[PDB]
């Protein structure tokens, strides 16, 4: 099918998920 990318699509998401949950710690940091 045109525009197919499932091999890369499903693994690219994980890299952003690592970065996002690492950043979530800054939204709950001690002050």
């Amino acid at each position: 099918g045109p525009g197919s990318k499932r091999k890369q699509e499903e693994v690219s998401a994980i890299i952003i998920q690592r970065a996002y949950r690492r950043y979530l710690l800054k939204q709950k940091v001690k002050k």
């Binding site: 990318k5 890369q8 699509e9 499903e10 693994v11 690219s12 998401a13 994980i14 890299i15 952003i16 998920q17 690592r18 970065a19 996002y20 690492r22 950043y23 979530l24 939204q27």
Partner: protein
């Protein structure tokens, strides 16, 4: 982005020193992958040779503690580097416009990988979108996530 914490540094300090021959803060190029396996990471021989080509450019057969942490930073970045996140986002960017639709990023982030929680994927749109118009601008979001 690539900085180690004091907890990462002390864990790498202990695991590196476990293979130090003299207490001088050094190991051999042969011990490198055995030291990585002490951290539970099993590297490929091609990865070890590529890392040693840059670290041991003088051909001494040895590595110092800070030259080991130099590669251990990059080995951790293989799942969350700024260039890795920008490429991973560009796979979802439908137009090459430097942005992703809010419902599109919400779809991927709750279809693929580990899944974000209902309130956690919503929390992403609040800071991934500039004003809540339904357009995440990932080119700023990657910089925000990787910045200390």
């Amino acid at each position: 982005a690539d900085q180690l914490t004091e907890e990462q540094i002390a864990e790498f300090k202990e695991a590196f020193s476990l293979f130090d021959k003299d207490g001088d803060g050094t190991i051999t190029t042969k011990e490198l992958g055995t030291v990585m396996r002490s951290l539970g990471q099993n590297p490929t021989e091609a990865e070890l040779q590529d890392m040693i080509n840059e670290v041991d450019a003088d051909g001494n057969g040895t590595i110092d503690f800070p030259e080991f942490l130099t590669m251990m930073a990059r080995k951790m970045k293989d799942t969350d580097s700024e260039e890795e996140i920008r490429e991973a986002f560009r796979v979802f960017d439908k137009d090459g416009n430097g942005y992703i639709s809010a419902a599109e990023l919400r779809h991927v982030m709750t279809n693929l990988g580990e899944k974000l929680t209902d309130e956690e994927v919503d929390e992403m749109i609040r800071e991934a979108d500039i004003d809540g118009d339904g357009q995440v601008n990932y080119e700023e979001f990657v910089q925000m996530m990787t910045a200390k």
